[PDB]
Design a protein around this ligand. Structure first.
Ligand SMILES: CC(C)CCC[C@@H](C)[C@H]1CC[C@H]2[C@@H]3CC=C4C[C@@H](O)CC[C@]4(C)[C@H]3CC[C@]12C
Ligand SMILES: CC(C)CCC[C@@H](C)[C@H]1CC[C@H]2[C@@H]3CC=C4C[C@@H](O)CC[C@]4(C)[C@H]3CC[C@]12C
Ligand SMILES: CC(C)CCC[C@@H](C)[C@H]1CC[C@H]2[C@@H]3CC=C4C[C@@H](O)CC[C@]4(C)[C@H]3CC[C@]12C
Ligand SMILES: CCCCCCCC/C=C\CCCCCCCC(=O)OC[C@H](O)CO
Ligand SMILES: CCCCCCCC/C=C\CCCCCCCC(=O)OC[C@H](O)CO
Ligand SMILES: CCCCCCCC/C=C\CCCCCCCC(=O)O
Ligand SMILES: CCCCCCCC/C=C\CCCCCCCC(=O)O
Ligand SMILES: Cn1c(=O)c2[nH]cnc2n(C)c1=O
Ligand code: NA
Length: 386
């Protein structure tokens, strides 16, 4: 069977993916430039991520096509075109890990969030990750490669000149690097961390969501036992437990509503200490209007804000998920090639299928923002319409 015919499909799909990679991610970068609301610390890691996806369609995919030919080239030159995609992958992981941490700081200590993360501190972080990504990605070029024991039969078959080799991935890149160093240390380890990071995010949101409900119940259940109370001692316990939850739930309309709430508990409390039973019961009745004029609104404003931060977390969680699903197949085939020599090698069409599946990750990113993030959605429309 002709080799080029099967190759014709692969090249066509690769070019198609490149087109969607460049266009889709350019729209993200253009969106952040225009809109001011999209200019924040979280989106800066998004643009860094989009930068990696753009560079896939421009270089990594052209590089992926050129490798498949098995053309003649210097072994060191062959290493760059084979390993450059590893730089772009390592950059994305650091970007995904940063977003997870940025979302964790935003939900854990929202007070300290303004002081811990800033605009400039993020730029320095991104630079370090890009520098580290080049080091990690292009590690084989420092000496950990198969240039020392080349395939001379393939070199003479291909008609390669002296010093040149038939440039193929599995020929120049050792599998111990791809499995132990790249897959396990650099990919799998940070991915497991993102799992644990997002787990602590949802768990933290779960606690705050019975906190705001425990205090609400603490307020109501202590109110109705003042009405049917027996003595001054009963009114004390119910009000002192309410006063505890009053300050607890607090952690200018905000501070003003509570000054009236706690102020009314203080007044009703002092009537209990004086022994005024019926006047203490009646004073605590004024809390009901107070409750449903300020508090109940802060119950559905604070609760509303929690759903925003959780929806933002899930939206980010999907990206890291889709990244894992796209890349993992290719890593497993590397694990089979490495760990099982008794097994047959994976067919060439399956190799092609895994590569394009890894490349597709570059396309899926902008579709998630538009479908999930409302600000990105409305931003895209006015750009397309103009
Ligand atoms: C700024 C962007 C657009 C430019 C991209 C640079 C690319 C096209 C250049 C930079 C260095 C180049 C490599 C340098 C050396 C060799 C060895 C030679 O035997 C085959 C080509 C090969 C492997 C080159 C391939 C193309 C290459 C990777
Ligand atoms: C999703 C994350 C947790 C990783 C998935 C687990 C990976 C590392 C596991 C799942 C199945 C495993 C393979 C199952 C079968 C074989 C054939 C055997 O002769 C050698 C080991 C080898 C080649 C295993 C290598 C590692 C492997 C690919
Ligand atoms: C991560 C999720 C989506 C799982 C994806 C499935 C991948 C990782 C699995 C499913 C079945 C697997 C294949 C089963 C059998 C063989 C034959 C062996 O001679 C080479 C590897 C090869 C070809 C395996 C490669 C990896 C493989 C394609
Ligand atoms: C930014 C600038 C964008 C433009 C970059 C140039 C793009 C493609 C040139 C094609 C690459 C040349 C590949 C074929 C060369 C050739 O003729 O074959 C070599 C020879 O057969 C074996 O040694
Ligand atoms: C991730 C789980 C860790 C799994 C470690 C990798 C399992 C594959 C393996 O170790 O297989 C060795 C085989 O005996 C070589 O001949
Ligand atoms: C779509 C955006 C990418 C822009 C570049 C498009 C062209 C690059 C794709 C393929 C050509 C690259 C080289 C192909 C194999 C070289 C042949 C050889 O030297 O034997
Ligand atoms: C091996 C883990 C794969 C990566 C998953 C990361 C996303 C976590 C999802 C949370 C919902
Ligand atoms: C990342 N990667 C691999 O892990 C791999 N294994 C075999 N070809 C491969 N190619 C072309 C590749 O890009
Ligand atoms: Na990417």
């Amino acid at each position: 069977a002709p080799p080029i015919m099967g190759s014709s499909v692969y090249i066509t799909v690769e070019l198609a993916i490149a087109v969607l990679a460049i266009l889709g991610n350019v729209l993200v970068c253009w969106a952040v430039w225009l809109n001011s609301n999209l200019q924040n610390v979280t989106n800066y890691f998004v643009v860094s991520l989009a930068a990696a996806d753009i560079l896939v369609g421009v270089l990594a995919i052209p590089f992926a096509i050129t490798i498949s030919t098995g053309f003649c080239a210097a072994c060191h030159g062959c290493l760059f075109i084979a390993c450059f995609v590893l730089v772009l992958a390592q950059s994305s992981i650091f970007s995904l890990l940063a977003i997870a941490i940025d979302r964790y700081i935003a939900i854990a200590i929202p007070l300290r969030y303004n002081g811990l993360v800033t605009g400039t501190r993020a730029a320095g972080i991104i630079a370090i990750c890009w520098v580290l990504s080049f080091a990690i990605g292009l590690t084989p070029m420092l000496g950990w490669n198969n240039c020392g024991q080349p395939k001379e039969g393939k070199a003479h078959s291909q008609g390669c000149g002296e010093g040149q080799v038939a440039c193929l991935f599995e020929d120049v890149v050792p599998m111990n690097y791809m499995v132990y160093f790249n897959f396990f240390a650099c990919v799998l380890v940070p991915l497991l961390l993102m799992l644990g990071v997002y787990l602590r995010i949802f768990a933290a949101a779960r606690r705050q969501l019975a906190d705001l409900e425990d205090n609400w119940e603490t307020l109501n259940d202590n109110l109705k036992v003042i009405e049917k109370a027996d003595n001054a001692a009963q009114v004390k316990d119910a009000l002192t437990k309410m006063r505890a939850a009053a300050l607890d739930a607090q952690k200018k309309d905000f501070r003003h509503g509570f000054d009236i709430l706690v102020g009314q508990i203080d007044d009703a409390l002092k009537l209990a200490n004086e022994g005024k039973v019926k006047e203490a019961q009646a004073a605590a009745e004024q809390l009901k209007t107070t409750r449903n004029a300020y508090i109940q609104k802060y119950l559905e404003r604070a609760r509303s804000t929690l759903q925003k931060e959780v929806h933002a977390a899930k939206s980010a969680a999907i990206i890291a998920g889709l990244f894992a699903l796209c890349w993992l197949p290719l890593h497993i085939i590397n694990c089979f090639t490495f760990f099982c020599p008794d097994c047959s090698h994976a067919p060439l069409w399956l190799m092609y299928l895994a590569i394009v599946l890894a490349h597709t990750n570059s396309v899926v990113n902008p579709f998630i923002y538009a479908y999930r993030i409302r600000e990105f959605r409305q931003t895209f429309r006015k750009i397309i319409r103009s």
